[PDB]
Amino acid sequence: AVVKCKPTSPGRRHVVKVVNPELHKGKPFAPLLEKNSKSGGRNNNGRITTRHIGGGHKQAYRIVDFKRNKDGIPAVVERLEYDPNRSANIALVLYKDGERRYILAPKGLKAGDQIQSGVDAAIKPGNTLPMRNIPVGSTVHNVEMKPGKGGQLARSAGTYVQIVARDGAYVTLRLRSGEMRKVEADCRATLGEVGNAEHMLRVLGKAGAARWRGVRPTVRGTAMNPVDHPHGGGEGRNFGKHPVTPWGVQTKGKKTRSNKRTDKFIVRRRS
Amino acid sequence: MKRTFQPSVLKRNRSHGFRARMATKNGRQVLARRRAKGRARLTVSK
Amino acid sequence: MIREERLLKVLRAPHVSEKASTAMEKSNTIVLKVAKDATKAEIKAAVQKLFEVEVEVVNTLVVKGKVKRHGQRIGRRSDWKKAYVTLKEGQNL
RNA sequence: AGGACCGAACCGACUAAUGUUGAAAAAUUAGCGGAUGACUUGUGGCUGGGGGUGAAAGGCCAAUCAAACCGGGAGAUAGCU
RNA sequence: GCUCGCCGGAAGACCAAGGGUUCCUGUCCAACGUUAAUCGGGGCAGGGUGAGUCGACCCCUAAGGCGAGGCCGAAAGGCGUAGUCGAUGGGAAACAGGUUAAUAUUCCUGUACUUGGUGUUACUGCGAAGGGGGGACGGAGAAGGCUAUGUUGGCCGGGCGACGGUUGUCCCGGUUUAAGCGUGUAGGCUGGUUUUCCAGGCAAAUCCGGAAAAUCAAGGCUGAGGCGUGAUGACGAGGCACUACGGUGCUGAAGCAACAAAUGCCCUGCUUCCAGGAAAAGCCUCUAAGCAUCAGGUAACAUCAAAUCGUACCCCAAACCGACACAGGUGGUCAGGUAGAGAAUACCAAGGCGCUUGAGAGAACUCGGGUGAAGGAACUAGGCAAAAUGGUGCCGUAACUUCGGGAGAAGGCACGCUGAUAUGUAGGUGAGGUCCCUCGCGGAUGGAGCUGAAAUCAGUCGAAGAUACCAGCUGGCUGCAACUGUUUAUUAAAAACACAGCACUGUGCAAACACGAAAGUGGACGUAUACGGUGUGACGCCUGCCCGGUGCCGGAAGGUUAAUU
Ligand SMILES: [Mg+2]
Ligand SMILES: [Mg+2]
Ligand SMILES: [Mg+2]
Ligand SMILES: [Mg+2]
Ligand SMILES: [Mg+2]
Ligand SMILES: [Mg+2]
Ligand SMILES: [Mg+2]
Ligand SMILES: [Mg+2]
Ligand SMILES: [Mg+2]
Ligand SMILES: [Mg+2]
Ligand SMILES: [Mg+2]
Ligand SMILES: [Mg+2]
Ligand SMILES: [Mg+2]
Ligand SMILES: [Mg+2]
Ligand SMILES: [Mg+2]
Ligand SMILES: [Mg+2]
Ligand SMILES: [Mg+2]
Ligand SMILES: [Mg+2]
Ligand SMILES: [Mg+2]
Ligand SMILES: [Mg+2]
Ligand SMILES: [Mg+2]
Ligand SMILES: [Mg+2]
Ligand SMILES: [Mg+2]
Ligand SMILES: [Mg+2]
Ligand SMILES: [Mg+2]
Ligand SMILES: [Mg+2]
Ligand SMILES: [Mg+2]
Ligand SMILES: [Mg+2]
Ligand SMILES: [Mg+2]
Ligand SMILES: [Mg+2]
Ligand SMILES: [Mg+2]
Ligand SMILES: [Mg+2]
Ligand SMILES: [Mg+2]
Ligand SMILES: [Mg+2]
Ligand SMILES: [Mg+2]
Ligand SMILES: [Mg+2]
Ligand SMILES: [Mg+2]
Ligand SMILES: [Mg+2]
Ligand SMILES: [Mg+2]
Ligand SMILES: [Mg+2]
Ligand SMILES: [Mg+2]
Ligand SMILES: [Mg+2]
Ligand SMILES: [Mg+2]
Ligand SMILES: [Mg+2]
Ligand SMILES: [Mg+2]
Ligand SMILES: [Mg+2]
Ligand SMILES: [Mg+2]
Ligand SMILES: [Mg+2]
Ligand SMILES: [Mg+2]
Ligand SMILES: [Mg+2]
Ligand SMILES: [Mg+2]
Ligand SMILES: [Mg+2]
Ligand SMILES: [Mg+2]
Ligand SMILES: [Mg+2]
Give the domain CATH number at C83: 3.30.70.330
d(CA A191, CA C60) in angstroms, rounded, equals 78
Structural domain count, chain C: 1
Give the residue numbers spanning the domain of C37.
2-93
Please name the fold of domain B1-46. Answer: Helix Hairpins (1.10.287)
Q: Which residues touch strand D (CB under 7 A)?
A: A 8-12, 42, 45-48, 51, 206-209, 211-212, 216-217, 219, 223-229; B 1, 4-6, 8, 10-11, 14-15
Backbone angles phi, psi at B30, to 5 degrees: -60, -45
Backbone angles phi, psi at C74, to 5 degrees: -95, 100
Please name the fold of domain A1-113. Answer: OB fold (Dihydrolipoamide Acetyltransferase, E2P) (2.40.50)
Whether C76 and C67 have beta carbons less than 8 Å apart is answered as: yes
The spacing between the Cα labelled CA in A10 and the C1' in E482, in angstroms, equals 9
d(CA C6, CA C9) in angstroms, rounded, equals 5
How do strand A170-174 and strand A180-184 relate by DSSP bridges?
Answer: antiparallel
Closest CA to A230 of A217, A249, A256: A249
H/E stretch holding A93 = strand A90-95
d(CA A207, CA A30) in angstroms, rounded, equals 33
Domain ranges of chain A: 1-113, 117-194, 195-271
Q: What's the angle, vertex CA A175, arms to CA A170 and CA A181, rounded to 5?
A: 35
| Chain breaks after residues in chain A, where C lies over 2.5 Å from next N | none
Nucleotides of D under 7 A from a protein CB: 1-4, 26-27, 37-39, 43-48, 52-58, 62-63, 66-67
Q: Which residues of A216-242 are buried (b: 16+ CB within 10 A; e: fewer)?
A: eeeeebbeeeeeebbbbeeeeeeeeee
Q: What is the CATH number of domain A195-271?
A: 4.10.950.10
d(CA B9, CA B11) in angstroms, rounded, equals 5
d(CA A135, CA A211) in angstroms, rounded, equals 44
